[PDB]
Amino acid sequence: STGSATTTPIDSLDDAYITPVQIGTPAQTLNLDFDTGSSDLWVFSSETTASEVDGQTIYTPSKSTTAKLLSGATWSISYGDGSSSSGDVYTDTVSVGGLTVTGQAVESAKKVSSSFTEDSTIDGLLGLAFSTLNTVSPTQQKTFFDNAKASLDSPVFTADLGYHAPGTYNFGFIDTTAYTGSITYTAVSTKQGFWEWTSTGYAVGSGTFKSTSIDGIADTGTTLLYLPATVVSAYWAQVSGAKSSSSVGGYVFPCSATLPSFTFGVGSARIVIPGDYIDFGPISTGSSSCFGGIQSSAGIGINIFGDVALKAAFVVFNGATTPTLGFASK
Numbered sequence: 001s002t003g004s005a006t007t008t009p010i011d012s013l014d015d016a017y018i019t020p021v022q023i024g025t026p027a028q029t030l031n032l033d034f035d036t037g038s039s040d041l042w043v044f045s046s047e048t049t050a051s052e053v054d055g056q057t058i059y060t061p062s063k064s065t066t067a068k069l070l071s072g073a074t075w076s077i078s079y080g081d082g083s084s085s086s087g088d089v090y091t092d093t094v095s096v097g098g099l100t101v102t103g104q105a106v107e108s109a110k111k112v113s114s115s116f117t118e119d120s121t122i123d124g125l126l127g128l129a130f131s132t133l134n135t136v137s138p139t140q141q142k143t144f145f146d147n148a149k150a151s152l153d154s155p156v157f158t159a160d161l162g163y164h165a166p167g168t169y170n171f172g173f174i175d176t177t178a179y180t181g182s183i184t185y186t187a188v189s190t191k192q193g194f195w196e197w198t199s200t201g202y203a204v205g206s207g208t209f210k211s212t213s214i215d216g217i218a219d220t221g222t223t224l225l226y227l228p229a230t231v232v233s234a235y236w237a238q239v240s241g242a243k244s245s246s247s248v249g250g251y252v253f254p255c256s257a258t259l260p261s262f263t264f265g266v267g268s269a270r271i272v273i274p275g276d277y278i279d280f281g282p283i284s285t286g287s288s289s290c291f292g293g294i295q296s297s298a299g300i301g302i303n304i305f306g307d308v309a310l311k312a313a314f315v316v317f318n319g320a321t322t323p324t325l326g327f328a329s330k
């Protein structure tokens, strides 16, 4: 089998991407944030504290003839941005772009933190990291990808995120029309439960490539590119007036600037992030200070190849017995 679904930016800045997902019988369609940095499929629901729901579409398990309470199971998660959610668990039929899994754990939120409430466009998350990170207790549950894997034509999914435009998540096949040149594959460590790999270096604009190992994770659920302070300083030093602002919480730059590109290495290959991808607009409405799309990972404890990086590439998440990651230009 295969599946193919379009993913759409939630706003004009590509702060996140939503993909429609069918849950239950008859189908209830929710717009979920596909997140290769976590491993829980959770949704706003009829059980979510009413004051914490503000415009989201909810899953109502009592209206699904295929929903079953997973007795005794609970979940609780907290993300790198400080947000969190928790609740109980049903199993139900879940379909993405024509690909169907029966008996998928659908984690129903009883509580969500303010940042989820305040974002009316995201109805939940669909985790695509390794199932060892799933938070369901006392019986850990599998991700949608892990449940689908054996049925797929090939044990892979791909992320093709757009810049200020829709893109595609495919399951079970590689669309050879969706990228240019060849796909370069690189080793993955699953030891922390993430799609963790090592970039071979970087360049700033038209500058020379610096060969240096940069361990990090491929994370579709993180907006920005978080890299070591040395790398980030070298980037922003090429932008007149750019500075790190403790009050704002990162590098800012004059909105009048034209930003240089940023290149990262994948083996002997190179992915180029155009400068415009690194512009996240005014720090507050009407400001002439703009927020940077490349930020320091110091204090996170891990480097994160988030959407800013991933949307410059066609990315293969290869879930074969030994997982690997593939990157192509597009």
Ligand SMILES: Cc1ccccc1N
Pocket: 037, 038, 079, 080, 081, 217, 219, 222, 300, 302, 304
């Ligand atoms: C996926 C992730 C892991 C660790 C810290 C932050 C994030 N976003």
